[PDB]
Structure formats: structure tokens, C-alpha cells
Amino acid sequence: YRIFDTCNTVSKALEATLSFVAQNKIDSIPSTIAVVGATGSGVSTAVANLLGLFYIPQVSYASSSRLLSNKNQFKSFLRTIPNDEHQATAMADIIEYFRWNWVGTIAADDDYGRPGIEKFREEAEERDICIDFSELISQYSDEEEIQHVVEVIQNSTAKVIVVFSSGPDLEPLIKEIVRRNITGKIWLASEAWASSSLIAMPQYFHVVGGTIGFALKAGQIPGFREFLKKVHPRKSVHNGFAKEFWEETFNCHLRPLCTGDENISSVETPYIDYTHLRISYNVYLAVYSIAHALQDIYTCLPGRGLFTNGSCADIKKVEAWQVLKHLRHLNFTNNMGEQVTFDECGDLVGNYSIINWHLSPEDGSIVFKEVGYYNVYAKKGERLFINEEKILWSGFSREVPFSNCSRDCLAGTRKGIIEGEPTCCFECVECPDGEYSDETDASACNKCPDDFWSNENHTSCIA
């Protein structure tokens, strides 16, 4: 392996990719046969533009944008994370489940946030939900833009906000919202920040507590934890990041001079402070998908081959495009016994878990409590299940909040249009005499039949 740091940046990942394709660049230094990465969808898009040129397979573990499913432009992209379409539809289901129609949307200005928020907008207009504001954010965003977004959130009466963004891209916005103490919003989180340590920090709870977010299906990697604690800046020579990891873990330099004898368990860092391995299991499955493709190459038969006239490539002189081909016809069983089969776009269908941000009674941290799930293997309308008694709204409350633009019109009253406002924003207009309204949120007033007249309250007909 040759593993690099991207720093969530296109430039670093592109330098690493140029390192990967050096032999190919000379053709058009070891030969990278496949690449595992990357996390951000813009990063993976830039990397796939280059790796797909040389037909080097690229199996990502976190990039979940739908744009990466276009196999004409991304010829050699696979992923072990599911696509973002189901997640946007799932947030549309969540809003339609708690009976809201007046929500706002915030998205990272990148290939992750924008397509997901666009799919959410389509699903919302399909489910008769009104979107008040649609704001774009980035981690490298000026204070003017963040202040404008905060003003919009304040100038709005939408308690529910849908946020397609990562942790870093959302962080400045959350900082400015906390600094102004904007309490009382209901945050719906995509997978990228629903468990982010940059946002789920205890000093933001009054703003972000009670967040309802999505998580991937946890996996099992037996022995991975003991492997994690075996890290050492000197016992690990291949892992050049181990030195800086140790330095940042123990606040020392190889700052006090380090000892090389500190304990990993002494410090509390996300390195071993995990309860589920979700993206880590995606990395595990990326590596095992590549290995099982290579094994498929290694156990081929002269009459049964994916290539021309059933020919089998030799594993001693295997090329990257052959591993790509064997990754398009891959079907292997996991350690947990599930089958991993990439579709015609290299996407791995997967369930979602719905978590809620609750404060820790003892530690004071933010605990992610599974409150529901989203079953992508079920028909539309029966995919969501949320157990509403496990949800603490805003982190402390028990009452499902109100996020409609206008209060419901009682019986005997109709809906009236406020021009310059969406359809969900209506006023209540008393029915004229002789016309009744026996329902809640009725559009027009119903006329009484012959030999019949409306009540005093205009709710029904009396002879």
C-alpha cells in the first residue's frame, strides 16, 4: 500500500493521485492497481477524473454523491457507502412523518451538499412540503456569508432545518449560531455530520441538542481495536502518520519531549472512542472487495474468463483495468455474512439508522441514541420507522415541535391565500352563511344542500 493524506482538499488528493498514476503517465515507481478513497465527494470526483483516465479502479468508502454514479464520466469509480438519493428521500419521509411542512435547507457548497439538497427539494415538492430558505455553506466561507445565513435562519419561522453538509463545512455556521444562542431549531442531519465530532461537542448542545441524523449500518472488524492500540511511532515504521498521531494524542514532540511509553487509552480521542465502525467498515469492505477481485483473478479457469474468449489475466502481470472488470462482476460474502455486489454504477445499497443527539448524564458529552431506521429494501412509504418516544426534542423536550407556516384552520373556516407567500402559508377565513366547513384545513367552504343552512358556527348543515 501507498497511503496519503488528502486533508479534505482536492490539491493534496490530486498530488497523491499523480503519484498513483506515475507509471501510467510515463506510459501515456510501483504500479498502483487500485485506490481506496476518498471521503469527500468533490475530492473523489477530482480523483476519479484522473484514475478513470488510466482505468485504475477507485473504491471509495465515504463519498456518497449521486454525481459519482455517472459511469460515463466516472468509468472506474465504486463505493461501499450507499448513494445520497435514499437519504434525501428519507429526510423527506421524516418531515412528512412528524407532520411538518415549513422547513429550511442548508447545504455545503460542494458535490455532496448540493445534489443531496436538490433531491430533498424534489421529494419535498412531491410530498407537499414548503421550503422557506435554501442556504449554501463552506468551511472556507467569509463571515459576511455566515452572518447572512444566520440572519436568514432568524428571519424565518421554520424550526426544522435540513443540512446536507460535512462537519468541517458546517462548523463556522454552527459557531456563529451558538455565539448568538439561536435556541429552538430542529436539525435534520445527513450522515456526514450526524456523528461529526466537530459539531457534536457539548458546548453547542443548547443549539444542536436533539439533532435527528442518519448513520450507516455498523459493521464488525474483530481484532481491529487491539490493532488500534498497538500503534507506536517507533514500532510502526510503514505508517508515517503514526508520529504526528502520537504527538497530537499526547501533546508532545518526538511541547514536551515524548516518552514513547504513554498509553493510548489514557487520552480520550475519536481514535478509540467509537461505539460503531461505520466508515471504518466501509474501508474494510473496500479493501476486501479489491482483494476478492484479485482472488477472482487468481482462481480463474481457461474456459471461464471475464475477458476476450474467456481468457484469464495472470495475477503476476495483472493490470488495473482487469481488476476494474472483476470489480464490476464481484459477489463475495462478508465477515458478517452479507453479500457485497456493486450495481451497474458501483453503488452499494444499504440501510440507514436514525440517531438522536442526547446529552450524557454522567460525562456531559453528546450521546447518539438510535431512535429509528430507514429500510431501503422496502417499498416507498414503508421504509421509515421512528420510535418517537426515544426522541428528546431540542435535547430535553418530549413534545413534538411545531414547524408549520400557519396554524390549522378550524372547522367552519377555510384557507385564504397570502400572495407573495408559499401555498403552506394560509390565513383562516370564516365561511359565509349557508356554507359550512366540517373538516380541518379545508380549502373552500362547502355549500349546504337544498332545504338546509349552515349553523351559527358554520360547521355543518341544519334543516
Partner: peptide, 22 residues
């Protein structure tokens, strides 16, 4: 890139991870 995890082998797998947030 000076910071890099390399181990030699018959078949080399590339890797891309965000060891730094930005």
C-alpha cells in the same frame, strides 16, 4: 508527500484518507 504509509508488496493499493480536517 513526506507523510505517507508505504509497505511494499506484489500488488500495491493506493489510499486516500483525511488525516487532517483541512
Amino acid at each position: 508527500p513526506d507523510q505517507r504509509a508505504q509497505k511494499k508488496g506484489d500488488i500495491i493499493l493506493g489510499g486516500l484518507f483525511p488525516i487532517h480536517f483541512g
